[PDB]
Design a protein around this ligand. Sequence first.
Ligand SMILES: C[C@H]1c2cccc(O)c2C(=O)C2=C(O)[C@]3(O)C(=O)C(C(N)=O)=C(O)[C@@H](N(C)C)[C@@H]3[C@@H](O)[C@@H]21
Ligand code: NA
Ligand code: NA
Ligand code: NA
Ligand code: NA
Ligand code: NA
Ligand code: NA
Ligand code: NA
Ligand code: NA
Ligand code: NA
Lengths: 331, 331, 331, 331, 331, 331
Amino acid sequence: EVYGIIAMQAAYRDYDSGDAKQDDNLGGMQLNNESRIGFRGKKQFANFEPTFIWQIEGGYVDPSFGGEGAGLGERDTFVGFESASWGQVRLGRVLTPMYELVDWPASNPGLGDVYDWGGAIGGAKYQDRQSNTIRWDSPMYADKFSIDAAVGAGDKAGLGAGDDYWGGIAAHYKLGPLQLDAAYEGNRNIEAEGQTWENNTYLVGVQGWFENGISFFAQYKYMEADASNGVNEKQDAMSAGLMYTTGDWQYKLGYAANFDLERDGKTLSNTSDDVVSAQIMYFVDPSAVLYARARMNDFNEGLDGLDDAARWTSGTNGDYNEYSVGVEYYF
Amino acid sequence: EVYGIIAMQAAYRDYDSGDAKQDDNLGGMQLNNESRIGFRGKKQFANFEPTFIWQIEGGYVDPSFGGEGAGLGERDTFVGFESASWGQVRLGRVLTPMYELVDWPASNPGLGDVYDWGGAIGGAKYQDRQSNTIRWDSPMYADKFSIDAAVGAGDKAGLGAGDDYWGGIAAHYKLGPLQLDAAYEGNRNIEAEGQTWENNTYLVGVQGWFENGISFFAQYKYMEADASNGVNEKQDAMSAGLMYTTGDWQYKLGYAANFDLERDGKTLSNTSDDVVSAQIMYFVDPSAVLYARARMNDFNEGLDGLDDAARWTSGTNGDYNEYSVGVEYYF
Amino acid sequence: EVYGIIAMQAAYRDYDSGDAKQDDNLGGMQLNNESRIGFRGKKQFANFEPTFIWQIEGGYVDPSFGGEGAGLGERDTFVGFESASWGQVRLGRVLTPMYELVDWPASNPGLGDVYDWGGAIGGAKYQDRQSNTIRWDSPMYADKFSIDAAVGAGDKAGLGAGDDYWGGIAAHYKLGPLQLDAAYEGNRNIEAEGQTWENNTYLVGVQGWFENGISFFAQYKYMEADASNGVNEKQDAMSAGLMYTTGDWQYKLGYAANFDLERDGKTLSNTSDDVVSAQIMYFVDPSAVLYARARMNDFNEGLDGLDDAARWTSGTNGDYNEYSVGVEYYF
Amino acid sequence: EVYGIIAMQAAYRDYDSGDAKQDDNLGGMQLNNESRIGFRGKKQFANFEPTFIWQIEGGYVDPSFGGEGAGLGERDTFVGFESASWGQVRLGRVLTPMYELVDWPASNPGLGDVYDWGGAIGGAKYQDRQSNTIRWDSPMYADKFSIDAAVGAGDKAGLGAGDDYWGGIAAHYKLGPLQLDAAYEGNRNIEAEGQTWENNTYLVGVQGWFENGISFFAQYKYMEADASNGVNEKQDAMSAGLMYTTGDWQYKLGYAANFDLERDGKTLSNTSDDVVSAQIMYFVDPSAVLYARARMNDFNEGLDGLDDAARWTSGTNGDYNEYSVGVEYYF
Amino acid sequence: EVYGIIAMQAAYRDYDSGDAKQDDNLGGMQLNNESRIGFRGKKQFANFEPTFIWQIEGGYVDPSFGGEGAGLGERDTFVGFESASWGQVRLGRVLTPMYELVDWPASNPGLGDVYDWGGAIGGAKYQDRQSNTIRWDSPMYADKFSIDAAVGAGDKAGLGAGDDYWGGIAAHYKLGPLQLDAAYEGNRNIEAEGQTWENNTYLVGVQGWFENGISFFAQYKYMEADASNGVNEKQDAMSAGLMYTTGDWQYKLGYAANFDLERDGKTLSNTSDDVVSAQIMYFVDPSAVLYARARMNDFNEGLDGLDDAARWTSGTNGDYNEYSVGVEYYF
Amino acid sequence: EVYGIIAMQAAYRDYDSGDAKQDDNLGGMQLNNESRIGFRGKKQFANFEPTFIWQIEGGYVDPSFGGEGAGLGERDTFVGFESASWGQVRLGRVLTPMYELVDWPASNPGLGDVYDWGGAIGGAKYQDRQSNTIRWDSPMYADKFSIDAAVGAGDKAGLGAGDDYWGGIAAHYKLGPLQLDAAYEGNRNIEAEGQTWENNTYLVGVQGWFENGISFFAQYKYMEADASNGVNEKQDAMSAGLMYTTGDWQYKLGYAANFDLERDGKTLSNTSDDVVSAQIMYFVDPSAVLYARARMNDFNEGLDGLDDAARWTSGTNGDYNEYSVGVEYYF
Ligand SMILES: C[C@H]1c2cccc(O)c2C(=O)C2=C(O)[C@]3(O)C(=O)C(C(N)=O)=C(O)[C@@H](N(C)C)[C@@H]3[C@@H](O)[C@@H]21
Ligand code: NA
Ligand code: NA
Ligand code: NA
Ligand code: NA
Ligand code: NA
Ligand code: NA
Ligand code: NA
Ligand code: NA
Ligand code: NA
């Protein structure tokens, strides 16, 4: 079977970097095509109760700030097995258990720049989509409880350039109308800024959907990092979202912010990021939606990494605002 | 729907560059696979009358002179809407209205090296394809008249590396067997050769198809560009093609030429290009065609761009001829 | 038609190179996803008896030691014709007649590192999947005898940087349970190490498949090469594999070895390669297999090329072992 | 040692019950004196590392709606032992682990009538203070994690009229500025409405205090109850509070509501309760506070218990509003 | 601060009721422990000029004619504030301003049965120490004049069973050795005998203390009440006491009497009460006193309340005499 | 002065009555908190040689089988005088001379159910703690001999409902290691079962304490009773306890028994009670003890009193055993 997500977003960005040439370059209107086509299937092996599953999902066709064309298998690509008793194991390229909760619902509408990759910490906060990974998903135990857990190889280790590795786990309980989310993921042997890093990171969150039409999510993310020279770093963040849905409309209000980083007990001044964004969405068909979106990004003013040299953050390009309309179609 | 254009051309090229190694390198026989797979669809959104359309077309799988593999969305990739009253808006990656007429019919068979990207002018004449584009195609008004019109972001602006942008427009009138073709396209903030350019380019052309089997096309392309230091450049060109069609055959004769370039009123001698070409085509099936073809390109001898350094042209590799057969199948 | 081959292998590698960072980088476990998706079709052109065929094969989605994503047409991608009379001629990117026999059956249980690209000879032994190629496959005449024959452009020549080329032929006679097969491939105009080479390469082998469950194969590969300054180089190699099949199981043991290289009559010390391997394979479905395998590679101790610089060989990463399980599914 | 809590609250109540005679009775102004005197001590037993501890806390001296005078040991009155390693176990009359979190912070600006005893469920949701109880408090593991756990005798069983019993547990993790609260308490052998009941009940909650002066708490209470004649009942509720604290002032907003009760799958119409309340507090001394408070109570319209007879609820007296000033002194 | 009044009175009573069973029951010797323990304090709130005050005074531990045990806060229990400028306001449970003059000095020795609660009138004459009260005491203006004034809720309204309330005022002028005392108190919404009453009560009195050792007190009490059916009742009374004090001794003679009641102008015969009493007192310590006292009580002969049923008065137990010794120690 | 006795006993009871609901209610584990707080003091009156003493003792805070809270003055509460000459006279609520010897040492461990308030005799065997009482405690004459003597009003007489009363005396001579004890107490005007009774009760006992660690007590109780209609009743009883003391431990074994009741010379069948008990006690601090104890009660089978209605005994609840640990702490 072929399956696509058609995804077009027209988006004007107004950057304030302090350099007007850079501002005019980086800013302006663009088209962010995140449409993608993939293939997936299941197959009942003649000698195996677990059902064989496989999927190859290609990448974003023409993202903004980037060129055209995407190969196959740039997104979730894997083989695996599934039995209803014990769930589903996958091997390949997937979302770590924590990254799932960081993305949804914690990065939407457009908070990603700060809650997804918006970090000031060293090492490697967590991992989003990693290609050398085993991941088991538990069933909905009692139709209420589920565990997600995964181990995999590191970014550099997947190309034979290093020995980073990682594991992570998260669980979700759905108490009636609410849902509780907790998550952990640890990285080790992370080589960066001239030292070797160990990252531990924990996430707590909640989600609810009530008949009055209000829905919400809120999350606390605690990020630690310890360097090989004995340096310690700690930074934490939050994301939460308020939405009302009436008829074929959803209004949404989102806020996310990473807070100031502490290195070796001392705090690093003005190293936090904050994002507010508003979104209206129209349920134009059971299979697609239209949306308009505006956002305000206030980014950090800098952090030297442990190498006497700067460290890159989402705010390294500078503050900006963005108004956008888009479409997303599922098939 | 999945749709392909399967397209193979075996083509021997005999280069005369002035360097025998260079001739031996660039020349010889090659296979030009222009096959492509694409995906496109329409969807009637339940709460919106204009029908949604989308298409993701992959690139040339193994071009000649190139390596293998191309992603999806390397060719026409877009989403859009269409209503019978006001036409068709598509957003993403499409062909500018002028490039449409440059490719068809003005650049085939083998007139492309000269009419398509074969320029001697500075700045950026017009655009082939380009992402970050909105394009409106008008209906066939009165079953005689049609407008094509579009604006989009520039090459560097699409990576936040500049503020190039452009707009363009074209029209078509149908007098019986004739069709009149006019088109315009202007580019702004084109950063090149150390200056900033504004390229205006104007095109008029005609097309005919007669019951006896005679068909023809002819076009005038007028190209202007102004660099930020007050320099001006102007160059003009033409392409025309004659074909008679009998039975399961079309013989064709094509000629295109860029003329000498004028910079600041002075003509820069031997900056012109011209190609002659012949092609026999057999309609081997309703769904496919075979062709044999031969062409001769004589290219310019060079011109420094406004940076005291050379300027790249389609002729920078030197004059060459090419004999080729190919197949093309549509599915 | 869509036809993927889904293939995942989890494989631990323990290297002994003499540098432990190298061991730690290069070694460890990784996920080698060799899944690939393709498109193929046939079409009867109404005005041409030979049947039209075409195929577009995508690359490996996330191989080990490599990043994610592969375009379409990275593997066997071609157009061609087929008649019961004269067989099948194809144009595009295919496998040379010899590389087919080097892959099957001679690298079967992981022996490729030594028998496939495991080379020490200079220039270019042969070609693994080459673009710009015409290749004719003969029918199975008398249902016992078949010819494979092809020529194509060289690797450097396909980018207009040279005029290297190659041709090759192989034959297969099927003496009852055995199959006797021989093959040749010659490359010309190969630029390397500061000179130009002509590589001649001959391979003979046999394979059998028996009702007892015994099946076996053995091949000898003879590789000669001559450089532009008058140097001669020769290396030879062999591969064999034994397999017993009970029920839904296959046991396999494979061995392959390149022997020491002779340059200008003088043999060069400690230049052999040898790989030993065992694998258990389970036929979990007619369309899929499970397998576990472990192998031991002993590689060369080094070789200066004719440019006084080293030559890369499969052993430039060092001796290493690997234990692995995988899955493979065909649709 | 003697210790007191001095506590005076002047409070006018405006009742709407539908009977004005009853309205004038229950309504009007009163003084709710919750002052109390207690005694506690520790003593290091000559032969015992665990420190003997004991406390006798008398009751509210003159509550509103009640007579004067209170004995000793009407509030938390107990003996127990404490070691720093494993915490402190107490025996006597204490707060169940879940009830603590209902009193604080969940019933905080005057919501108790709704979240504390504001119930519609049958049986016995949880327990206030029970004077036949063993309760263990964990240390602050890592000065971050704490477990509280207890079992005890029931209300009727403490008088030799029954065999009620109960157990409960809760935990609290302090993630930097946050605190997460979870809690459970189950009662058994509850004789009521002519049947024997089993109540299971779970609580989720969160707490934060940030430099900007914001503080908050939010809680979900899930209450189930099963009668021995096979009836099932389910009800749930929530409490949350938002407060800003500037200088010597705290503004506070609290909202709590029980939702409609479900009995045997069927919902009981208009059986929910809702309370809104606002409070200003002045930190008149490190040891005491003055406060003003106003609140709005909307109660259920009734529920028959499983005995064909009415069931008493916190709302059985009817809706009312309340404005109040008070003082509370600690010594 | 802990403060007690230790108080024991051994008192034999000889009752004359007309029934020897009642006489033998009600009479005999008894121990009247009026000891009580209290807790009280003042505190200067750091952010408030008025000084905070509070007191919790327990009840009589074993009164005569009563069971053992008394809570805390059964007597004067309150919180309040004081500044030298405007006096002292207390909130909680206190003595009404008239009751103070009724108890001291008008009811001792043993005149309470007649002057304190001994009324014969319907409704509610006044209040003996009622909770739910605010009370303001003025400074000694000009070091001669003092006013006391307070309002609070009624008895039934203090339990939400009605809406009775009351107010009252008293003043004190000090003419040399004299003090003139006047006081008023009115009660409203008094539910009794099936009607609702409004009772107003006015009191005038004087006290003197002379250098030669003579002291005296005399008071007139005027008691009104109006029932809701239009009935009116009026009764009046007096109490006076003379005492001479020499050395460590005070001899005292007390007389008090309720007079005949008038209902609707018509006086009801034999409804008066009067008591005669003598007491010798020895000052055994600055902190304590011993006393012997004998008193003789003659009570009224009865009256139906407006409910056709008899009405309870201090005399419903019948006439009696009483001889007693006691001790009183203050700490 | 403040003084406390903190006393907690965890005690499981297993009842056997002949009805298992009663067994289930009454039985089970409970927390019996017998902690109590008191206040006492002495004062030398400046004009009086006898030293003034006073005490206010509160009741048990949460007994087993009973609710929370106890007032002040439920236990020994009195005023009195003390001189070295004549000892100590106290007035108020104290323990009668006989109840002391019945409580200590004859009732513990756990023998009270049978020896203290256990009983079958009519009227009122004796009085436990009585209010309205004067009791003279004699000095220890010759440092070996002492008298205790007291009279007070009866239980019903203390509320003016009767004229029951009582007096009593006991003496103790201390012959070396032994102490010989005799005691009497008589009650009069006891109304019960429709008759008036005079109860006579005599007790003799011994006590010993040796350096060997052996200590023991034995006591015989003789109870007679005569009713107003001329009936006679007689019951007698005995208690003894043997204890050995090693180090900080005390072993104790206790037995007590009421014998069958004799009414009017005829014995009433199966009316005896006997209880046996064992306890281990640990002297964990000079002011505190830990103890475990188990005991077995076999109670009488019933007795109609002189009203043809049943008579209540300690066995009206049925036979039972009890296992328990407790704590006891002083001041
Ligand atoms: C030379 C090989 C090599 C050298 C050094 C490091 C490597 O990792 C490799 C490979 O893994 C190769 C392959 O796997 C091939 O894809 C490979 O194994 C292969 C195949 N599966 O048939 C090919 O035909 C090759 N390709 C598709 C054109 C290619 C090899 O050329 C290389
Ligand atoms: Na831009
Ligand atoms: Na899951
Ligand atoms: Na590795
Ligand atoms: Na058009
Ligand atoms: Na073949
Ligand atoms: Na705790
Ligand atoms: Na009494
Ligand atoms: Na006063
Ligand atoms: Na009221």
